[PDB]
Motif scaffolding. Sequence first.
Motif, PDB file in Angstrom:
ATOM      1  N   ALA A  58       0.851  -1.333   0.115  1.00  0.00           N
ATOM      2  CA  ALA A  58       0.121   0.031  -0.006  1.00  0.00           C
ATOM      3  C   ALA A  58       0.882   1.123   0.016  1.00  0.00           C
ATOM      4  O   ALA A  58       0.303   2.474   0.065  1.00  0.00           O
ATOM      5  N   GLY A  59       2.338   1.115  -0.045  1.00  0.00           N
ATOM      6  CA  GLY A  59       3.033   2.218   0.003  1.00  0.00           C
ATOM      7  C   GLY A  59       3.629   2.935   1.332  1.00  0.00           C
ATOM      8  O   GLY A  59       3.708   4.041   1.474  1.00  0.00           O
ATOM      9  N   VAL A  60       3.083   1.944   2.405  1.00  0.00           N
ATOM     10  CA  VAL A  60       3.371   2.398   3.584  1.00  0.00           C
ATOM     11  C   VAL A  60       4.732   2.133   3.914  1.00  0.00           C
ATOM     12  O   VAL A  60       5.315   1.223   3.465  1.00  0.00           O
ATOM     13  N   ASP A  61       5.368   2.879   4.751  1.00  0.00           N
ATOM     14  CA  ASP A  61       6.565   2.520   5.362  1.00  0.00           C
ATOM     15  C   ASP A  61       6.664   1.686   6.576  1.00  0.00           C
ATOM     16  O   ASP A  61       6.180   2.091   7.754  1.00  0.00           O
ATOM     17  N   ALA A  62       7.061   0.435   6.573  1.00  0.00           N
ATOM     18  CA  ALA A  62       6.750  -0.527   7.420  1.00  0.00           C
ATOM     19  C   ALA A  62       7.923  -1.485   7.713  1.00  0.00           C
ATOM     20  O   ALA A  62       8.589  -1.978   6.928  1.00  0.00           O
ATOM     21  N   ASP A  63       8.517  -1.256   8.943  1.00  0.00           N
ATOM     22  CA  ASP A  63       9.542  -2.025   9.321  1.00  0.00           C
ATOM     23  C   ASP A  63       9.173  -3.092  10.147  1.00  0.00           C
ATOM     24  O   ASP A  63       8.487  -3.020  11.442  1.00  0.00           O
ATOM     25  N   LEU A  64       9.595  -4.376   9.706  1.00  0.00           N
ATOM     26  CA  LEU A  64       9.023  -5.625  10.598  1.00  0.00           C
ATOM     27  C   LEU A  64      10.224  -6.209  11.394  1.00  0.00           C
ATOM     28  O   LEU A  64      11.518  -6.510  10.639  1.00  0.00           O
ATOM     29  N   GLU A  65      10.272  -6.521  12.669  1.00  0.00           N
ATOM     30  CA  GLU A  65      11.434  -7.000  13.339  1.00  0.00           C
ATOM     31  C   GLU A  65      10.954  -8.307  13.800  1.00  0.00           C
ATOM     32  O   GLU A  65       9.882  -8.252  14.886  1.00  0.00           O
ATOM     33  N   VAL A  66      11.364  -9.689  13.531  1.00  0.00           N
ATOM     34  CA  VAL A  66      11.286 -10.840  14.194  1.00  0.00           C
ATOM     35  C   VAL A  66      12.307 -11.063  15.006  1.00  0.00           C
ATOM     36  O   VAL A  66      13.411 -11.444  14.587  1.00  0.00           O
ATOM     37  N   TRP A  67      11.914 -11.057  16.211  1.00  0.00           N
ATOM     38  CA  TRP A  67      12.781 -11.503  17.562  1.00  0.00           C
ATOM     39  C   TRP A  67      12.764 -13.020  17.688  1.00  0.00           C
ATOM     40  O   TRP A  67      11.957 -13.517  18.001  1.00  0.00           O
ATOM     41  N   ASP A  68      13.918 -13.621  17.551  1.00  0.00           N
ATOM     42  CA  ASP A  68      14.140 -15.028  17.903  1.00  0.00           C
ATOM     43  C   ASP A  68      13.750 -15.174  19.180  1.00  0.00           C
ATOM     44  O   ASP A  68      14.428 -14.618  20.169  1.00  0.00           O
ATOM     45  N   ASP A  69      13.040 -16.533  19.086  1.00  0.00           N
ATOM     46  CA  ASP A  69      12.798 -17.006  20.411  1.00  0.00           C
ATOM     47  C   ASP A  69      11.914 -16.625  21.502  1.00  0.00           C
ATOM     48  O   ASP A  69      11.614 -16.964  22.501  1.00  0.00           O
ATOM     49  N   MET A  70      11.309 -15.287  21.014  1.00  0.00           N
ATOM     50  CA  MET A  70      10.767 -14.480  21.875  1.00  0.00           C
ATOM     51  C   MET A  70       9.178 -14.842  21.856  1.00  0.00           C
ATOM     52  O   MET A  70       8.572 -14.879  20.951  1.00  0.00           O
ATOM     53  N   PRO A  71       8.516 -14.759  23.158  1.00  0.00           N
ATOM     54  CA  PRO A  71       7.053 -15.300  23.313  1.00  0.00           C
ATOM     55  C   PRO A  71       6.282 -14.173  23.017  1.00  0.00           C
ATOM     56  O   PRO A  71       6.807 -12.936  22.916  1.00  0.00           O
ATOM     57  N   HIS A  72       4.981 -14.280  22.616  1.00  0.00           N
ATOM     58  CA  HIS A  72       3.812 -13.234  22.354  1.00  0.00           C
ATOM     59  C   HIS A  72       4.080 -12.164  23.343  1.00  0.00           C
ATOM     60  O   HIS A  72       3.997 -12.358  24.689  1.00  0.00           O
ATOM     61  N   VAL A  73       3.957 -10.865  22.758  1.00  0.00           N
ATOM     62  CA  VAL A  73       4.262  -9.750  23.835  1.00  0.00           C
ATOM     63  C   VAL A  73       5.270  -9.999  24.952  1.00  0.00           C
ATOM     64  O   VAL A  73       5.019  -9.413  26.027  1.00  0.00           O
TER      65      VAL A  73
END
Length: 297
Positions: A255-270
């Motif tokens: 959609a042309g939004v500036d979005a940065d995704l961080e996938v943190w290894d081994d981390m649980p929900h929130v």
Amino acid sequence: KSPELDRVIGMIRERAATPYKHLSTDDDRRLYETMLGSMPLDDDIQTERLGVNGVPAEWIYAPGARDDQVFLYLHGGGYVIGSMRTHRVMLSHIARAAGCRVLGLDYRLAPETPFPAPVEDTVAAYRWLLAHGYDPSRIALGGDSAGGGLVVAALVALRYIGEPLPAAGVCLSPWIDMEATGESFTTNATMDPSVNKERVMWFAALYLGGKNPQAPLASPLYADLQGLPPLLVQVGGIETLLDDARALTTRAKAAGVDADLEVWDDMPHVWQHFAPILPEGKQAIARIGEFLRKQIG
């Protein structure tokens, strides 16, 4: 395998062990409070309860806070549980890291007040900020899980009703799909100690109150994301909600939004919820602080 992570996983499993389907709604709420209650608010944090256009809310801030920068926060809990009681400590960490005030909403929860009540409340609160002289360029929205989806939905709603958009959005393990169709709900089913498809279905049925599960404001997986401000999205690599964060990021970029995704290894929900006792939680919140400083600073 860090001892700190083990401790967090243990607290999560202890809660997750209790059969929630036999509990009253309030006992389910209290069970969540119980999990998080062992971590107290720092003594130097200032809070204030107030109404913002009728929505019960809470200022939360650390010393030295810039009073003109605001992080409007939407707590998680499936749109059914959660509150400032469960979230205020995490928010104080974010506040301190970002050097801003947090305005957290005790928005309307289901089943008492179902979808789209939370979207209405988020818009009411943002309108309140604007009416009281806060600049859109110094305001960001944030939320975890349900609240993370709500950030996106509220942003779309605001654009749809012509409000000046805030400077950024922060989504922590966002839940953007009422039907839990993401493949990680299958592949990460045994990896994720906190969240499974059954529980998500439970929340969605309560939130929706019979409305269409694919409604764009309940499931922003289906929403027009054009025009949204830059997003920071954090999520754990073991999460059943992993694909919700990925799908949100993919759709936003398209959609042309500036979005940065961080996938943190081994981390649980929130996992940021456990920042007081978890290095990775403090690290992730530091990252959030940097993002906010860039966007609303």
